[PDB]
User: Fold Naphthalene 1,2-dioxygenase system ferredoxin subunit from Pseudomonas putida.
Amino acid sequence: TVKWIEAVALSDILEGDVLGVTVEGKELALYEVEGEIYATDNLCTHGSARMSDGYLEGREIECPLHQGRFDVCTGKALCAPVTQNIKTYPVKIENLRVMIDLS
Ligand code: FES
Assistant:
């Protein structure tokens, strides 16, 4: 199923920005990487931590706790302590707006 839901106006995403959004009740992180936007779940897989409070360095988001890192394009866990990949979501831009597929 692909079901596109509007997330933010794309002005809201500056360069190399991570932004936390809440869409249909779901907390998601939007990342800007070299002109593309990616989306993951906003909760770390290792603990209670929000990705959007972390540090985005190129395509790697560092959790605000523990030094765990994910690749934002694939969701792959990149270093200890994170071992479970983070869920990624399809993104597109329509206009104008950043849309996310929550299905
Ligand atoms: S809570 Fe994110 S690495 Fe531990």
